[PDB]
Design a binder for this molecule. Structure first.
Ligand SMILES: O=C(O)[C@@H]1CS[C@@H](c2cccs2)N1
Ligand SMILES: O=C(O)[C@@H]1CS[C@@H](c2cccs2)N1
Ligand SMILES: [Mg+2]
Lengths: 412, 411
């Protein structure tokens, strides 16, 4: 029936680093990747900081010429994907290229490119719109360009489920493998929404922290003084592989992907229900998918965005799903350090969950100085905590009330 | 693996504001293409397209709700509401966890982004709508539909450019087949007819510039074709597990038996001349369905009226079907509707289902002089009544992303 799926390669760009090891080093050290934004003038904006990718060199991956045609979200997605494939040791050949697919998504996609082309249109006229505008801006072009560059001929698609994108991308890619549509998938997400429209759009909704004087303290999930999320950029990609395929080529296996859950809240467009009912159904779906007792869960990488309503909803959802075991597991939000990578959040957080398994350590929730009312679980405040972790869960919730949960397990 | 049937359909297209009106146009060989009226294209090289005419969002949403939502979302919701109504499905506490949605778009909220860009550049960030982000992102058709109807099953959105509608329907069917849902609303929507859209595709020289005869512009496989015609709209299907459908006495249009995907891994905006990726995709879909290629009677082609694209599809069909390529009928309804981009696969799935219901191959209009090698039965000019037990619908998109759906008569 259903085939087993393992993780054999990972890649990342984040506010903490230009690859996985550097990012993870920052995570375990409790380092913030958040700083005043330097690439544009935000004097007129209520939020002037976020998580930028620092010192990205696209020329390690693509020619300058090729890169100029592509929005940053595509460049970031390609970088993460190339890293992951290299990390996997996979060799693409005529014998396997039809069995290797890609599903790299984004929540917002090419907003910066669209903005720049809109500026050209309004100020100069339609003949200043780039000939590469459409292919350089649409969300499926990470999958498109990766497939072209590596020669991948398997299932080729992209999800866009807002802040849940990365999680859904990885889960659905795993389903393709489990049900025999592919043997390998490169999956994850990328995001670069740090332009006027992005900061201004989230600003207009009053969704962002406005702690401009102390950006590194802004993202503080479950803390009583939290005041909205921190906008961040980057990408995560995983090479998912059928177990026997991985074993046959002597691949290094990080972990097994054992469970995937989805649900819809059917509640509100931008706010979760206070009781976290949809998130609870999603996690339960994922645990039953994995054939697990909830007591087997050791670590949860929370969605944990540093919003008042969101953070408390997750606590409620975890208490509902896990009962008294909610007090035995460890749960943390790495968004405390990275900020919120939107569509890429689930991808980078899947990577962190896998590394939590590899290194047997719960990443910290930094800035958790004063836990809010009811936020009385082990939230790994301040410092990384070495502990036994056999099963790790990663949650993402997004606009439209779209939920995703991934369950990873140590592989023996 | 559980069987999946189609129990409801909905549509907005250049030919009509619902399925029956659109299908009437298709069978009559009507063009939905006309000079664009909603903006000033005097300075553009292409000034026509397929618009949705006389859309009344207040049949579906309050004025307040509508003001928050980009047109592509309005179109998607309209098609979705129609399809759910057409299905007769009753959502209850007992089944709401088993009903999901996967409605996608290729480009999404270009018009809304354009309008907000004006506020940003002329006034600054403080004039950006508080609803800008949720009202513009692609997953909001799925989001809003789930909220309005109380659907708590799988909730997601595909964005695979011109293949979106096809992939959305295919992956939704997989959810049902493998037990993740009993019902899914699936398809796509698009409204890219703004300065950025016309200007963007214009800058790439991808559009027909036959401004003097807009209804003759979309001419798939014709020697005088000169690019695609940009169109707007939406399609949605209610997909349902067979026993679930039977239990409530649903009207079943057809069965969805196969879904294939592939990547060309060739070029960003052009397929390979031999259509190798499309061929692999169709073969995958047929194997998924457990069908011999000789069982295929009708193909609703991607058929965009681009030089490279059209010929690649013929080559792919010849490769997959061999001598049977001369027995089947293939047509492009884009000859009449133009190219609905992300919604193309959704409306074309609907047309394939209706081809099965009515036992008729829709025409490829404007096919006056077939190009070299385009010597299959392309149903030139007029609808052709024939036996159709199995119908295939193809979509190919930027990045070389391919999808094929296989539908069969349900007895
Ligand atoms: O990631 C985020 O910042 C947002 C806010 S918390 C979550 C939602 C759940 C339901 C609607 S919005 N997504
Ligand atoms: O739908 C369209 O108009 C375009 C052109 S034909 C198809 C492609 C296949 C491979 C890359 S582009 N998509
Ligand atoms: Mg921080």
């Amino acid at each position: 029936s259903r085939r087993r799926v393992v993780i054999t390669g990972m890649g990342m760009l984040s506010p903490l680093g230009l690859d996985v090891p550097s990012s993870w080093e920052g995570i375990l050290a409790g380092r913030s990747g958040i700083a005043p934004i330097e690439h544009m003038d935000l004097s007129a904006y209520s939020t002037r900081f976020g998580g930028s990718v620092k010192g990205f060199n696209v020329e390690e991956y693509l020619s300058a010429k090729e890169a100029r045609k592509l929005d940053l979200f595509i460049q970031y997605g390609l970088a993460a994907s190339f890293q992951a494939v290299r990390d996997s040791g996979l060799e693409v050949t005529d014998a396997n290229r039809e069995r290797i697919g890609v599903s790299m998504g984004s929540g917002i996609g090419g907003l910066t490119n669209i903005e720049n082309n809109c500026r050209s249109l309004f100020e100069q006229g339609p003949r200043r719109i780039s000939p590469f505008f459409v292919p350089g801006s649409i969300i499926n072009m990470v999958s498109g360009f990766l497939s072209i560059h590596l020669g991948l001929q398997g299932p080729n698609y992209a999800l866009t489920t807002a802040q849940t994108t990365g999680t859904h991308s990885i889960g659905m890619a795993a389903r393709n493998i489990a049900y025999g549509e592919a043997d390998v998938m490169v999956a994850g997400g990328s995001e670069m929404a740090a332009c006027g429209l992005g900061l201004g759009g989230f600003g207009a909704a009053r969704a962002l922290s406005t702690r401009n004087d102390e950006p590194t303290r802004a993202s503080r999930p479950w803390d009583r003084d939290r005041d909205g999320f921190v906008l961040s950029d980057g990408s995560g990609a995983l090479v998912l592989e059928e177990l026997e395929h991985a074993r046959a080529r002597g691949a290094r296996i990080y972990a097994e992907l054992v469970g995937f859950g989805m649900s819809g809240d059917a509640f509100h467009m931008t706010a979760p229900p206070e009781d976290g009912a949809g998130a609870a159904r999603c996690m339960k779906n994922a645990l039953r998918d994995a054939g697990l007792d909830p007591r087997q869960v050791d670590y949860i990488n929370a969605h944990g965005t540093s919003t008042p309503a969101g953070d408390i909803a997750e606590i409620a959802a975890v208490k509902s799903v896990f009962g008294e075991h909610a007090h035995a597991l460890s749960m943390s939000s790495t968004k405390s350090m990275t900020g919120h990578l939107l569509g890429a959040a689930g991808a980078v957080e899947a990577i962190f969950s896998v590394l939590a398994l590899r290194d047997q350590v719960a990443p910290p929730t930094i800035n958790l100085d004063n836990p809010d009312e009811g936020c009385d679980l082990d939230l790994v405040a301040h410092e990384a905590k070495p502990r036994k972790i056999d099963v790790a869960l990663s949650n993402s919730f997004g606009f439209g009330g779209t939920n995703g949960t991934l369950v990873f397990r140590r592989f023996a």
